[PDB]
Write a protein that binds this ligand. Structure first.
Ligand SMILES: [Mg+2]
Ligand SMILES: [Mg+2]
Ligand SMILES: [Mg+2]
Ligand SMILES: [Mg+2]
Ligand SMILES: [Mg+2]
Ligand SMILES: [Mg+2]
Ligand SMILES: [Mg+2]
Ligand SMILES: [Mg+2]
Ligand SMILES: [Mg+2]
Ligand SMILES: [Mg+2]
Ligand SMILES: [Mg+2]
Ligand SMILES: [Mg+2]
Ligand SMILES: [Mg+2]
Ligand SMILES: [Mg+2]
Ligand SMILES: [Mg+2]
Ligand SMILES: [Mg+2]
Ligand SMILES: [Mg+2]
Ligand SMILES: [Mg+2]
Ligand SMILES: [Mg+2]
Ligand SMILES: [Mg+2]
Ligand SMILES: [Mg+2]
Ligand SMILES: [Mg+2]
Ligand SMILES: [Mg+2]
Ligand SMILES: [Mg+2]
Ligand SMILES: [Mg+2]
Ligand SMILES: [Mg+2]
Ligand SMILES: [Mg+2]
Ligand SMILES: [Mg+2]
Ligand SMILES: [Mg+2]
Ligand SMILES: [Mg+2]
Ligand SMILES: [Mg+2]
Ligand SMILES: [Mg+2]
Ligand SMILES: [Mg+2]
Ligand SMILES: [Mg+2]
Ligand SMILES: [Mg+2]
Ligand SMILES: [Mg+2]
Ligand SMILES: [Mg+2]
Ligand SMILES: [Mg+2]
Ligand SMILES: [Mg+2]
Ligand SMILES: [Mg+2]
Ligand SMILES: [Mg+2]
Ligand SMILES: [Mg+2]
Ligand SMILES: [Mg+2]
Ligand SMILES: [Mg+2]
Ligand SMILES: [Mg+2]
Ligand SMILES: [Mg+2]
Ligand SMILES: [Mg+2]
Ligand SMILES: [Mg+2]
Ligand SMILES: [Mg+2]
Ligand SMILES: [Mg+2]
Ligand SMILES: [Mg+2]
Ligand SMILES: [Mg+2]
Ligand SMILES: [Mg+2]
Ligand SMILES: [Mg+2]
Ligand SMILES: [Mg+2]
Ligand SMILES: [Mg+2]
Ligand SMILES: [Mg+2]
Ligand SMILES: [Mg+2]
Ligand SMILES: [Mg+2]
Ligand SMILES: [Mg+2]
Ligand SMILES: [Mg+2]
Ligand SMILES: [Mg+2]
Ligand SMILES: [Mg+2]
Ligand SMILES: [Mg+2]
Ligand SMILES: [Mg+2]
Ligand SMILES: [Mg+2]
Ligand SMILES: [Mg+2]
Ligand SMILES: [Mg+2]
Ligand SMILES: [Mg+2]
Ligand SMILES: [Mg+2]
Ligand SMILES: [Mg+2]
Ligand SMILES: [Mg+2]
Ligand SMILES: [Mg+2]
Ligand SMILES: [Mg+2]
Ligand SMILES: [Mg+2]
Ligand SMILES: [Mg+2]
Ligand SMILES: [Mg+2]
Ligand SMILES: [Mg+2]
Ligand SMILES: [Mg+2]
Ligand SMILES: [Mg+2]
Ligand SMILES: [Mg+2]
Ligand SMILES: [Mg+2]
Ligand SMILES: [Mg+2]
Ligand SMILES: [Mg+2]
Ligand SMILES: [Mg+2]
Ligand SMILES: [Mg+2]
Ligand SMILES: [Mg+2]
Ligand SMILES: [Mg+2]
Ligand SMILES: [Mg+2]
Ligand SMILES: [Mg+2]
Ligand SMILES: [Zn+2]
Lengths: 60, 48
RNA sequence: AGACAACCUGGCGAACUGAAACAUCUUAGUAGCCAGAGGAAAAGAAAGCAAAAGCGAUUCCCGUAGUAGCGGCGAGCGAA
RNA sequence: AUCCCGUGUGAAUCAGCAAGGACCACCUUGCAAGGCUAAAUACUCCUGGGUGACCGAUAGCGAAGUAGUACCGUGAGGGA
RNA sequence: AACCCAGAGCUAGCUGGUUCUCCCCGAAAUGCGUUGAGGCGCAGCAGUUGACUGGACAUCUAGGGGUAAAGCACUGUUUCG
RNA sequence: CAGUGCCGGAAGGUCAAGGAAGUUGGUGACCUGAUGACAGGGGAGCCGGCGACCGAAGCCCCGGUGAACGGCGGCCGUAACUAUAACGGUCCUAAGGUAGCGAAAUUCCUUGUCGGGUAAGUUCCGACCCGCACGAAAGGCGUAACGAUCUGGGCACUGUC
RNA sequence: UUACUGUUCCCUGGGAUUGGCUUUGGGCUUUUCCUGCGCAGCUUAGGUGGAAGGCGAAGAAGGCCCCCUUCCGGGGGGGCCCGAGCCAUCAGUGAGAUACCACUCUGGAAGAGCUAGAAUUCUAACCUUGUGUCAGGACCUACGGGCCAAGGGACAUUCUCAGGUAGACAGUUUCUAUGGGGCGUAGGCCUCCCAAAAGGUAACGGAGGCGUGCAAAGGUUUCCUCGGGCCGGACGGAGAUUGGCCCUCGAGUGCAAAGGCAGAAGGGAGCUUGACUGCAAGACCCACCCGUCGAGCAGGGACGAAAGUCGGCCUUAGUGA
């Protein structure tokens, strides 16, 4: 309503089916208050595929 | 489904209005052919 | 032409019931009715199975198997 | 998918057509839109033999004697 | 919402009934869920059968607690000064 | 004449099957890639999804129609003495119960109050209106005749007592 | 019955039965013609190509007028008059000459074409009548048969598909506890009491809440102390900001209540994303299904000088097999 399920997604993940050991597109999920903060949330979070802490943006 | 205009190819044995002279080749709707021309001897349906 | 116990083939074709209610589903293409023919009827001589190896019209029994599946993926149904 | 029907459209002939569980390619298998055919299987109003850890008159068939009788019911039917 | 026959021995978590003897052991009427409440599922508590066990009845010590009593240190309440 | 029904209307919105421009996917004769046990593009054909636009009635929309379904209110304040309210204010509706009747087969409180009939009347008759909750074709109010009708009283008559 | 799901009567569209001629007309076309104010300018620069050749007596420039479009700047164009010119790299301009020519786009026109839609007819399908007329051994003013005629007519009917639509009809559903009536209320979770000092525990017993919220109200490093009295101080007052003494946990903690928590779990500041991936010994709670706590290990990080802390939130509600 004013509080929402938002999907965080790795920016450096290539959906094309990569050639490395573990292929897949990291997404986390979390909640945001779409009124308070209209800024698309950016968060550094761990990616099981890239193995490094990457940056996860949002999805529409 | 979709209505498909039925086409009968015929030869006229007598002269009739809008159609033409005797001994003439044409293409017609099935209704016109079997309900009007054919009972009166006027046309002949052709498949050689 | 009519008669004819059950069996059989075709035609119409339920409901109680089960699902702890009920509507899809189940009961069941059962009962019942109608018509038909026989000592049996029906089916039947691959426009079929199968799988890279092969079979060689139909029917019936054992098995595969309560398996694969179907299913308000419920009650249940259920092959080859 | 295969199979079979209402309404409407509507092909191809072996250089084809169909099937292999949407569909396409390849390969395998088969030849729809004409018919007919015995046996193995189902049944008991019955017929002839046989057996019975079946009954013995409240049993066994409803019925060991006028038994579908007497009687009851307008009738279908019930029924000793 | 006729009657007779048939499906039909319909269905009845309901009521009634359920037949010889002796021996041993022997409950429950609680909790949870339920279109459930007079039904049922599991648990609790029978019987019989195995496998491990060493307890029970007493005796003393140790733990934590916030009841009875008590109190006004807090929270209320209350009388008069 | 708001709600509902029914009838009439045709401008706009909505509107199925079905058509249908057009895109889109699978396959694939082939074309290239590639230190992995393969992969990426693709003509014609065949097959599949999507589909702008066209697409009636109906509905939304506009009008009529109560002997069609039905409905017909509150709150205040005011007059030579107490009083009452013809008259005003306000509220809310589609509109606020007119004529006639009224303690009624309708009246709760209630055996209302008054009058009559009785020595004495919760019934009966007439009237008041404060109609819990009358009312106009689910008809309203009258009414001569009629009734094995319901209900009150009287003369005659009697073992009803 | 304005409960649910449907069926039927009935209405309306496609298809079929089902045809001919004519119109009118919505959307596409087949030749072919109309039509374009970036600015530098001969001036309302159509993109792309052939591109030094074209347009003329099958009769142009130039003025006299008719028409239509219109941003009244000007453009296409009919008649007449006129009689030897309008022209190209000529320099501008991303793009070239109104010298010409090909597929075409912005919208318009016209005769020609597809499909409806619509209206109008026509007659042969189809429908409807007939004491009209034939007909067998004899009738059929006995139904009907053949022929003829009359009225309708591609409508209607019938079939199929689709939308609408009648409790007319069919099958069914309509909880539990209220006070074992209506009626509204209650049904899950959390805190307190009842609850008898482990845990658990009923009543239509007594009190209340929840169906979320925070990108910081999370993580971390580091610093701080609230409230209440009394006193001073311009407005300023009981109460705002400031100074000071006394009491010491009485404030706060997103929101109920309970239990916690003072150099703090309360207030502030700096940097962040651990509101991680992979897990997990063992415990608690337990009919089952769920539910809760978690040392420890690896990866890749945040903060911090480092030790270390960090798998959301002081805890317990904020949920659904
Ligand atoms: Mg056709
Ligand atoms: Mg016979
Ligand atoms: Mg017979
Ligand atoms: Mg026979
Ligand atoms: Mg049933
Ligand atoms: Mg039933
Ligand atoms: Mg049942
Ligand atoms: Mg049941
Ligand atoms: Mg035989
Ligand atoms: Mg045979
Ligand atoms: Mg053979
Ligand atoms: Mg053969
Ligand atoms: Mg086949
Ligand atoms: Mg097969
Ligand atoms: Mg069939
Ligand atoms: Mg067909
Ligand atoms: Mg052929
Ligand atoms: Mg096929
Ligand atoms: Mg084959
Ligand atoms: Mg053949
Ligand atoms: Mg076939
Ligand atoms: Mg054959
Ligand atoms: Mg045969
Ligand atoms: Mg005897
Ligand atoms: Mg006997
Ligand atoms: Mg005896
Ligand atoms: Mg009955
Ligand atoms: Mg039985
Ligand atoms: Mg049965
Ligand atoms: Mg029952
Ligand atoms: Mg004992
Ligand atoms: Mg006890
Ligand atoms: Mg019960
Ligand atoms: Mg039990
Ligand atoms: Mg035991
Ligand atoms: Mg102690
Ligand atoms: Mg102690
Ligand atoms: Mg203490
Ligand atoms: Mg005490
Ligand atoms: Mg005391
Ligand atoms: Mg005290
Ligand atoms: Mg005190
Ligand atoms: Mg109205
Ligand atoms: Mg109206
Ligand atoms: Mg109106
Ligand atoms: Mg209307
Ligand atoms: Mg419409
Ligand atoms: Mg469509
Ligand atoms: Mg197309
Ligand atoms: Mg493709
Ligand atoms: Mg390939
Ligand atoms: Mg491909
Ligand atoms: Mg439309
Ligand atoms: Mg009226
Ligand atoms: Mg009275
Ligand atoms: Mg009274
Ligand atoms: Mg009186
Ligand atoms: Mg009396
Ligand atoms: Mg009176
Ligand atoms: Mg009244
Ligand atoms: Mg009234
Ligand atoms: Mg009345
Ligand atoms: Mg009256
Ligand atoms: Mg009325
Ligand atoms: Mg009356
Ligand atoms: Mg009268
Ligand atoms: Mg009478
Ligand atoms: Mg139709
Ligand atoms: Mg038609
Ligand atoms: Mg005619
Ligand atoms: Mg006649
Ligand atoms: Mg006749
Ligand atoms: Mg006419
Ligand atoms: Mg028609
Ligand atoms: Mg329909
Ligand atoms: Mg009903
Ligand atoms: Mg309905
Ligand atoms: Mg306590
Ligand atoms: Mg205790
Ligand atoms: Mg306790
Ligand atoms: Mg309780
Ligand atoms: Mg912080
Ligand atoms: Mg609080
Ligand atoms: Mg507290
Ligand atoms: Mg802090
Ligand atoms: Mg840890
Ligand atoms: Mg460690
Ligand atoms: Mg680590
Ligand atoms: Mg560092
Ligand atoms: Mg915190
Ligand atoms: Zn990634």
């Amino acid at each position: 309503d004013v509080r929402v399920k938002v999907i965080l997604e790795c920016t450096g993940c290539v959906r094309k089916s990569v050639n490395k050991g573990s292929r897949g597109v990291s997404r986390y999920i979390t909640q945001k208050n779409r009124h308070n903060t209209p800024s698309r949330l950016e968060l550094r979070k761990f990616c099981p595929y890239c193995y490094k802490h990457t940056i996860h943006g949002e999805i529409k | 489904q979709k209505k498909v205009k039925k086409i009968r190819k015929i030869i006229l044995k007598e002269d009739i209005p809008d159609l033409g002279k005797k001994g003439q080749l044409l293409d017609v709707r099935a209704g016109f052919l079997r309900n009007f021309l054919l009972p009166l001897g006027k046309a002949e349906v052709v498949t050689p």
